[PDB]
Structures are given as structure tokens and as C-alpha cells.
Amino acid sequence: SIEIPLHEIIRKLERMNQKKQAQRKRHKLNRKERGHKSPSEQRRSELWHARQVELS
Amino acid sequence: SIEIPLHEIIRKLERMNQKKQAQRKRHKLNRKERGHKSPSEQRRSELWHARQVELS
Amino acid sequence: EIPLHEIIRKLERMNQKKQAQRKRHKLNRKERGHKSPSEQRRSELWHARQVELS
Amino acid sequence: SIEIPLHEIIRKLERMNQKKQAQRKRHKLNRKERGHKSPSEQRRSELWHARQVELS
RNA sequence: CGUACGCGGAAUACUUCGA
RNA sequence: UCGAAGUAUUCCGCGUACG
RNA sequence: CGUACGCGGAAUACUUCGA
RNA sequence: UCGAAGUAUUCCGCGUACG
Structure with missing residues (x-):
């Protein structure tokens, strides 16, 4: 029986977002x-150099 | 297993709202x-003049 | 104070309504006897597959 | 710019909540x-014992 | 004592995109 | 080397509420 | 044919706020 | 007389997507 404006729902999430954003x-x-990286994090890195060094 | 960016959920509800706004x-x-009004839309109007008159 | 439980429930109804709206x-x-351009294909494209089983 | 079934938005919040719920x-x-309590929790507790020992 | 949501404050790990 | 998002395993403090 | 979503475009009625 | 929000009946068009 509460009037919950969409605007008021939007709001609550914007918060949930910027919060979750600030955490990353x-x-x-x-x-x-x-100096930690996840398996994937490594693989991007390594490859990235490979490409761009291979460019000159 | 598709990823749902909160920034999108928001963007969606934002839309729902304007669509709902313009309707009104x-x-x-x-x-x-x-020239139609509601039972509620009457009381408020009547009561307003009456209040507004009861001032001047 | 807005519990999540509500955002949920609010959206539940909205969906179930847009459901009946459809x-x-x-x-x-x-x-x-009206169809969308899309509905024609999805229809005439369908029978061809069925008239071919027996 | 992909379509987002409202069932899935919901499906996300459900999850999200069931987390909040489970941490608490x-x-x-x-x-x-x-054995740690909160000021609020102290009242709530004590203020309940007196309404309990009395009213039965 | 038991149940229930809110918020603010912070860890650790993994995956996915994009130059 | 940068940027964007998503997912899990966690901890702390206060605050209404309801029998 | 049956089924599940998405999008943009409309009418009509009623209630609560707020000056 | 103005502004804001929430619930209700109901209508139309295209788009996918599934077996």
C-alpha cells in the first residue's frame, strides 16, 4: 500500500551501482x-605486449 | 547466463518512467x-478557492 | 525505507500485467485475421516442414 | 542496446536480495x-522482557 | 527472546567484453 | 599496459520494524 | 500451428501527496 | 487554479525467440 515512485526505485539502484563500482x-x-592477477588477467597482458611490440 | 549491467536496468526503468510521464x-x-475532473480533483479545487478566498 | 522485497513485488505485478496486455x-x-510480416514467415515457413514428415 | 526481459531484472533482484538476507x-x-549487542538491540531486548514478565 | 528490511564501513578469489 | 561489467566466499558497526 | 520475450505508439477512470 | 506520484479497464503496430 506504499506509493513507490519509479524515480525512487531508480535512485536506490544508482546507489547500489556506485557502491558496487567503488568496490572494484x-x-x-x-x-x-x-602484484596479483587472475589467470585471465595475465593472458590479456602477455598478449597485449606481444601484439604491440610486434607492431614496430 | 547473460550479464546484466545495472547501468542498463536503470536505463530501462528511466524509460518506463518517461513513457509513464508523457501519458499523464x-x-x-x-x-x-x-472539462472533466475527479471527485478528488474537485474537493481540492473547491477547497483551494475557499482557502484562497478565506485569505484575501 | 524501501526493502528490495518490494521492488521485486512491484515489478512482478507490472510484468504479469504487460503479460495479459499481450x-x-x-x-x-x-x-x-491480422498478422505481422514476421508472423507470415514463421507460419508459412512452418507448414512446409510439417507437410514433409509422413 | 540488447532487450532485457523483465523476468530477468526481477530474477536478478531476487538473487541480490537472497544474498543480503543470507549475510544478515x-x-x-x-x-x-x-555476545555483542547494539544499543537498539539492548532496548528491544530489555524493553521486551518487562512487557513479557508483566502481561502474562 | 524470535523474526524482517535499511544504511554506512571495508577483505579475498574468479569470468566476460573493449584499445 | 589501460578501460568497462558480471559472478562467487567473507567480515564490522549502528538503525527502525514485528509477535 | 502452439509457446516466451522486446520496442515504440495510444484512449478511458480513480486515489494519495505538495502551495 | 497549479505541480508531483501511484493504482484500474482497455487498444494498436513492428520486431525477434522457442519447440
């Missing part, structure tokens, strides 16, 4: 300071 | 042109 |  | 183990 930004930094 | 705008106008 | 709307096009 | 459940059991 921080988690990302934490992983750099440890 | 048209609808509200359509009413005025017939 | 279910009715679909049935309505049938009594006219 | 264990987080609650974590407190109970340390």
Missing part, C-alpha cells in the same frame, strides 16, 4: 599493490 | 479539454 |  | 557468538 576501484588497487 | 501529460490535457 | 492483444489480432 | 542471518549468528 578499491579492490583493483589492492590487487596491484600485491 | 497527454491524458491530463485530454481531460481539461472535456 | 495475451489479450494477441487474441484480438486473431479474430481480425 | 550469519552476521547475526556471528554477533550472538561474541
